[model samples]
Target: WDRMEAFVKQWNDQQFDDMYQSLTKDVKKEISKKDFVNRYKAIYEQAGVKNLKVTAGEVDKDKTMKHIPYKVSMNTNAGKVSFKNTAVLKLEKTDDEESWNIDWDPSFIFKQLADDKTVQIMSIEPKRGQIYDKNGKGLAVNTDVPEIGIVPGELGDKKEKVIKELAKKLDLTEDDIKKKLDQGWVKDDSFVPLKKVKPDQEKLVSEATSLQGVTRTNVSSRYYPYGEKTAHLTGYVRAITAEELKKKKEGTYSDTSNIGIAGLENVYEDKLRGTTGWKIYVPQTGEVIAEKKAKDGEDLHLTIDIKTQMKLYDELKDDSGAAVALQPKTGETLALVSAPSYDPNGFIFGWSDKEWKKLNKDKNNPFSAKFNKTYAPGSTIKPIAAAIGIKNGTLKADEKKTIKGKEWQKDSSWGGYSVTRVSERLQQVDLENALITSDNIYFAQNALDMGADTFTKGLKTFGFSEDVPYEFPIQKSSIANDKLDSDILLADTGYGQGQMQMSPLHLATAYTPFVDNGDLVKPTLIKKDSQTADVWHKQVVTKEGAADITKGLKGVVEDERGSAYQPVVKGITVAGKTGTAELDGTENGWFVGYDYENKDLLVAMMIQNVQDRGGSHYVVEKAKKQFQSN
Candidate 1:
């Protein structure tokens, strides 16, 4: 009994070779060790078995035979397979020992299995989900496009004429059509797919399908209607690589399966990939033993407005930059754009080595992409700084400072360093004038007075060095490493310079405080997020303080001498700010604006290398075009 106990233990350990060794000598002659061991391995792996378990109770002897009761359970392609069975043991002896050896049989694997039988595993592939905007505009969805193919048998003697006409119509050579038809896998009845035509392309479809052997098949494909305009938001999908598949669970993905690998597509993959079903059956009898049905993936709906996204993309499409547009009250994103973008469809249909290399070699490199990236907030953050100055009791809204020139330093501590603005020629620089003219010395002086501790703490309330509480991942806005230990660094940081880094999305959210009159609305990307404004919001300023700051921002566009005076749109009460952050030698042009009383849209835009252009003025000009388009 003890020997049989050890014998059963070997089976649980997957020691098929050792278990076979203990089999009756005659049973060994019937089946080779290789056959016994490999069969177990092949079935378990091929069936996608997981968490296998085997156990048994002590056996009692009956004459020369013993029955060891055992249970087996495991997850397979067809869900769970569990059953109870007896592994029969027999008493046997050799010259050296008297022992009980198990009488092994194929029935031990599964009661339904026999030595003559084999199992077939089949997969029921799931349909990938779709994504849409708030207005029900399809962003990424399965749509049909024309697939041009040649049916050789239907060609008859017209094959030669059919081939030439297709080549002429599709701009391919006659040899191109001939080689495809002559492929080793191509049969006379096979539909040899040549290329795809743009959806509803009348010229290509009408010309090609007119040929005798050529026909158009409407095949379902993942299509992004907006293409490069919304590439960063909609993303694209491709086939799972061998390496990526290996890292995933067995039977979950197939060799030809595709998965979303970027943008929101990847972020929502599990919910969008759906459940792939499976069935295990007897191959010869065509009898299914177990089966599981496939479940379709959940569709993702977003807060994005396709019209708004396209309009924003068009304005900055020629430049390298980023822009964020959303409603302040809902915190729902309307448009999120990264300029100088690429067609993510290339990831699906495919890109040649030359095309791929051309994109990578481009100087601006569209993928340098700014939407999720961080940079110096520049003067766009001045209103927030002015609010901070008021909150910390360093400056009143009406406080005025006397300044001689565009540059100033705090008493020259040790070396030559000064904060400079475009102009500070005005002798009496008050809060309104300083904000309107964007005077650096006044804000810098306020920073020196408030000190580093108060300044850093104030910025944190505005979400600096903090995460945006949303699903889509973004870099946290943060201050520089060394904690602003010196006066010069703090002074530079005062007017949105120094070591400031902020994502365009987060920057847009920070302005929500000014728009909402005090409460900072947490950035929300998805449309289904509940109506819990107070749940995620925090007070960044008092109502009075926010009103004060907003007054200045409104003046920035309304007042003639204000920085962002470029006409945004006709007959709209516009409130806005403009910023030019100098990086090394070049400049990052920035503008943030919205309607004051008829508050609906808010946009924050940043364009890079604007030193030679108009700097923040250039961004203001672009903002005018974007707002007008909306």
Candidate 2:
């Protein structure tokens, strides 16, 4: 037993001379030490085995033979591989000596040992989870699709003809087919997936399968029912790359694993990906010696309303902008839309490198959700300034002030900076009239009167420059004069023009206090049994102050001369604010408001590059249409 242990230790240590010395003389005659060492080393190197452990079992009843079991594990270029086997060692007795000789063969290393046979680990991808809307409607789901591929070796003398036929049938160029066939690992029988096709394309797929050198197999593929409508929300999945596979843990992922690459799919990858299974099998013959069953991923239910989401997407289909709607009482997002979106199905089913590059290079940035993208507040920020003014006693609901028709400035401390009103000048305007008319001069003067220190402090307290309270990524809203550098900047900030920038999401949530009696609610994308209208902040404005501000916003939609009055629905009462900010010779339009009857519904919309369209009225009309639909 001790001699056998020593022999195994030497073999594991690659000490060929010592191992050979431990063997019986008759064994040496059968296999040369050099040849034995070279063959074992070749097998080990080919399998990329690094660590080895060998143990001898209890002696048999005869006491002349023992069973030796060995285990070796390795991470190979193909995947992970492990080997386990037992070898019989017999005690040989000669006239003068006795020693153990391994009763071994090449089969000890691998069951199927041959020049052409090689061991490989096979990965079985698990079924991905489904994503559903609030009412159990499918948003993203998995479906069986036909995977088209080529077997280059099977083409033989007609390889060129087969390639040409495949190119024409698959709508691919001959050069593309040739490039795939020219891959370094391409072999006659190798199955290389060319493209995934929907099951509905049965006629085309059937035709392709009949062609020489072509193969078709069903594969689990991701599908988005609404396509571009929910592209930004549900996201998409794609094959894992070589670089990513290197970073993954062994047995956790495989070469053919598909990973979520964007949006909610990326955010909840672990839960959505499930567990991948594997099998250890012989490559020459279809034999699986070991295997594990895969676990399908868990389904995810979201707060999206399919009807509302579709409505918003339809409205912004041709525009490069965003819109967000939420339940004012609980802050549950009903719909979030970013326009000019690409079909997520394209990413999984058929998009090419050229198509991906084109989408990335688009000027509209279709990949990003505009709801979280920042823009100038325009007139939409007036309500926040009004709330601050009312809270700090700088402006009163009943108090009146006069302003020049086009522009106004309090002395020249502004150094050529002045506030201008797009509407006709008013002789005198109160809080209600100021907001209804979106009087820039009135709000600017009040912001300055409130003083830089107090106004900026109020803005910060209201969550400006602070992380937005939401599940998804949101850019923080910022004040143009966070440091209160100058009175002109402060005045401009009050009217939503200075450096103040905010996302449509931020504006929509910030308006909650007006509808909820001074309590701010944190928004969420997940549905809950009870209202999640949990108070995030308190007393942003006094109840009376909030009511007064709400009244003025009501005038913005109710009054005939109001900027948003043009699009007002006949029966439903709407209250909101309009903003049109001019920057670098272009304008950004904004409209944030809620339905008076349906006090729980609030909507915010922003139209980018509005220089061609009319000012904030474009977004205002869009908001009115949405409200009417609701």
Candidate 3:
């Protein structure tokens, strides 16, 4: 028993020579120590086996020849492997005393093992789920395509003919097709792919398949029908890398697996990436001893309206900016657009190094989603400041303030920083009239009158300094300098200037209170279920304060002299604010508003690097077109 125990220990430790000497002379004559070690080592490495345990079991009752049973257990990539088998041992009489030698066999390691047997695990890929818009139209889906290729060895004497036929069918030069076939790695059996033909282009497949050596192999690939229009939202997928595989759970991914690299595709990866099945079998016989069926991933449905998304994209495509529209009552996002976008198909199908570098080098970054990017709120934030001022008793809704000129300087104790307006002068202004004219002096004086601490508290009450509550990533809105110690800075912040920055989505969400009777509803991208409640909403101000702010925003559109009045649709009424945010002397135009009559529809837009374009009116005109169309 002690000798058998030592033999088992040495075998586990891979002490090949010691374990070989402990075997019967007949076994030693059949296999060398070097050969034995190499055989098991290959299996161990290939199977990723570890924590091996071998123990001697119950002895047999026979006196002449003893039969010993043993148990073997180990861990492998597939799962745990444990079994029991008996090893026959014989007691041999020597000149000194009787001794036991293991009657070894390859079957002791695994039930079906043999010197020449090869074991392999094959991975079965699950069908990835499709992404759909609210209308049940496919955004990102899979399509069966044909890969045109050649079996180099089978081309034989007709290699030139085959290459010429394939080149003509694929629209490639004959030299290019020949170059692919004559590559260094090319072999007789190697299938060198020429091009992937789409499902709609079946003629290309038929033409290539007729050639003697050319083959048309069916393959599945992700297809983006809307391409660049939906690129920022749907993202794209590609083969998983070795580094990505390491981060994934075991049995969850394989070398050939495809994974989402960005956007909603990456954010909802686990939901869209179903379980990958596998089979362990004998490679030669094609016998699957163990198998698991793959589970197709669940489909994802979004609240996006494809038609509206397309329209917004069309309007913004010529410029570098972002636009988002949503339901004010429910917060369901209807359309989101980021300009200077790229076709997602380029990533999945193929992309050249030069093309990728060009996109990266472009001043207008196509990959970034500007809807979540932050910028100064400008005059668009005045309604919120007015709401806060009235709610906190710092300013009266009807109280009038006199303005002297285009610029107003604070008292000497307040650093005397001049706050300038677009217009030369306004003799008198109240809250409602101030919003209509977008009077910087009136709002700035009111914010300072409320005191820095009280004004900061007011900003927090409106959900500033916090993350925008949404499924997707959003930048937090910040108050200018947080510390309102400087009276001039506080006044500047009151009129939406200084260090304040907010995302287009955040600004769109913040205005929900004016439409929802002071209740701020949290925005969502996914379609809501019947059971889902509106628990995310809370009142940011009293109904009366919201009503007052709403009334002022209404004047911004209906009043002829209003800042946003020029772009207002003739039949439709919109309660909105236009802002021209200045950062380092460059202006970013903004427009945030909701349909006054409908009350449910809300839209926000920001045009970057306005560069002499007419203030926020550029954004107002864009919003006007969107509202009029809807």
Candidate 4:
């Protein structure tokens, strides 16, 4: 009983002392009503005595308790000093209710205590992965560069002192350092850029690091060694944002690094994005702390040939077009070039707001604008129609069928959309002649005679309406109206026009059956040999039909008055087809062929938005040049 009474008294005294230490003269004099109520509320709850009173010489035996544990402490700026105290007491019933007998020891007071160190080091962001080209060339790798950052609160009212100190070490005026600090320091941002000084300015950073409130840490930034040409493919990096953090929870992305904003960077984000590393540091007062090493992200390799890419860049120069050269047999994309595109390097170290806005506002849409285009086959569909016709047995290769010139003709109100068949038109022409002249009337009549269901079946057999597996992710291929009914639609469909859309790569690949001797070698972006048999999309076409089509297509390039004869290589027995797809009043020209010598390459060429709406003659000239040079 004595010990419990003594301990309670000591605890009460200690609580008052602690409050005294925390309270300043101003706090004591101007304590608000709320503060006063809070101060006495604990005592009221404990005592539970109405109008709680303490009287002299009188004690209440019924209210008095025995031994119990209690804590007593004195809090001061130096630290908290605490101790336990004990007491003994005897309670006597009093005649007067207000009178009490209070017995306590004067020497049982607990000791005062002091506080402990509570400062800690803040955490930092983790690093991202490195990106490389398919041939193992570094695209966006890491480099050790000296960078400067600031903590605004640390600088505080001593901004001048910080600026002066930083200037003495770095090559800058106080104004320049202040300007950098001002630009980067936001009220909410704890970490902001003071400057991104050059390595040569190490002395400046060192001087700033030597300042009382300054902090220095080693960091990594993306390094682009190829300068401008390869930049578009690799993309750039920047600080992560709040929205990205939300995605981090979804496991689709990481919070530590930047995203692939364009090109292959965007295409292979999952593969390219790597884990970030972090380190722990023990904060020490008046001493330097060692930092733990951070983990690095993974490395990525793409299948792009820097040399080949450069070559295409040279050929296109500044033209507003695209050039894609791939091995048709294996679907290995060798070279893809989009001209009037900016180097991706501009975004490496984080593009300035101005640079970013300029690129975004560019009328040409440089980012996604240059990506490969997949359009309706246009005139490119003619060869496929011919192949389908022969495959279905509806039209024999040697069966001569000539339009009677009055086709699409009407002698009435609307002007006749027809013309007379040339005198040289044969009574019955074989498949070779039909393809060479791109005889629209001949194909239209036969395709109409073949009917929709039959023609569509043949088209599907040739892999039409099917998505060919490609290297990079692609927008799906379209074969709208795969089931055609109208004569005009069928004629336009036979000639690669109307609703028959295809990416340039798609048109070139659809001809795989013709060039691969009807083996139906599916076109792809990656090498087929590296993949499993199940992954291969084998085309279904007869070898005999393939051989016949090859002969007829070859004639289109070698025969006199053949549309593509001028572009034919003298010694190479190359077969090609020319298609001029009418884009309303404009035109999309196409020329696709295969080299018999290599037996490995299936060449497909296309030139869109032609000035004169002419046929594939322009494509032929370019292809001939390409074949001759090779």
Which residue pairs come into collision in candidate 1? 465-477
> Would you give me the overall lDDT of model 1?
0.80
Worst 10 residues of 2 by lDDT: 72-81
Predict model 2's lDDT versus the native. Answer: 0.79
Clashes of 4: 31
Off by over 4 Å in 1: 1-43, 57-70, 83-117, 147-216, 249-251, 362-369, 528-536, 566-572, 628-630
Please tell me which model should have the higher lDDT, number 2 or number 3.
3
Cα-based lDDT at residue 325, candidate 3: 91
Ten-residue stretch with the least lDDT total in model 1: 529-538
lDDT of 3 by residue, 1-630 (tens): 787888888977867678777777677787888877786776665454568888788885846567888888876656677778888877766568777888788877666656666677667789899899988899989887778888887777998777776776676889888788789768888888888766677886886788888887878888889988988888778889978886766678877798999778887888888988766666656655456668899888988999889988888988888998988877888888898898888777666568788888989899888898888888888998888888788778887788888888777664546787767446777788888888888878888888888888877877788877787788888887557768778888889887788888888988888885787777888886653425244677778887788788999888998888886577766788889887647788999988877886898999987858897888788887777434
The estimated TM-scores of all candidates read 0.84, 0.77, 0.82, 0.64
- Give the top-scoring candidate (TM-score): 1
Compose the digit string of candidate 4's lDDT tens values, residues 580-614: 66653766666777775566555566655654634
> For every model in order, what is the number of clashing pairs?
1, 3, 1, 31
How well is each residue in 1-630 modelled by candidate 2, as lDDT tens digits? 677678778866767677667665555776887887887665555333445555555544557777777664544323455667666777887678786777655555555654456555667687888988889999989888898988877666887888888888888888888887788678767898787897688899988878887888887778998989999888888888867876776556777788888888987898998887766556777665456667889888888898989888888898888899988887788998998799888877777688888898999899888888788887788888888898888889888887756878879765576788877656788998889878889889988899998888888767787898777788888787346688777888878778888888888888988885787778888777785477767788888988888888999888987888886577766789888778748877888988766776888988878878888877887787767544
RMSD of each: 4.8, 7.3, 5.6, 13.6
